[PDB]
Amino acid sequence: PNFSGNWKIIRSENFEELLKVLGVNVMLRKIAVAAASKPAVEIKQEGDTFYIKTSTTVRTTEINFKVGEEFEEQTVDGRPCKSLVKWESENKMVCEQKLLKGEGPKTSWTMELTNDGELILTMTADDVVCTRVYVRE
């Protein structure tokens, strides 16, 4: 029941397919797959508010919101979009996502906590889904 901590991914799937949906070229995806190379993350939990800063090596994103209201944040490719998050269980909340300008694809992701404290994160984009398991540090 706590996402606050560091996070080092251990497994993941639908990576290239999430970079082909986000982008369209070909090298544009392989650069994001090589950029990831098991990226790190750090979640700060302050109640219904969940902040999430991810860092690879040359990139570094970070979002922040509350479970109940919408907000502005960065997506996974590098575009601005207002995300939203509602709870699902005692430690599993879902998330919706739409750009803040223009329009094309659709983004939405989720994040669940394990009874031990682990943290897994799922992702969606139009009709795809990028899942990645994250274990505290």
Instruction: Report whether 21 belongs to an annotated binding site.
Output: no
Residue type, 83: S
Biggest distance spanned by C-alpha atoms of the chain: 41
Query: Binding residue per annotation — 33?
Result: no
Q: Is 136 annotated as a binding residue?
A: no
Query: Which residue do the tokens 């994160």 mark?
Result: 121
Token pair 């993941």 in the structure block, residue: 12
| φ/ψ (deg, to 5) at 51 | -100, 145
Residues of each annotated binding site: 132-134
Residues of each annotated binding site for all-trans-retinoate: 132-134
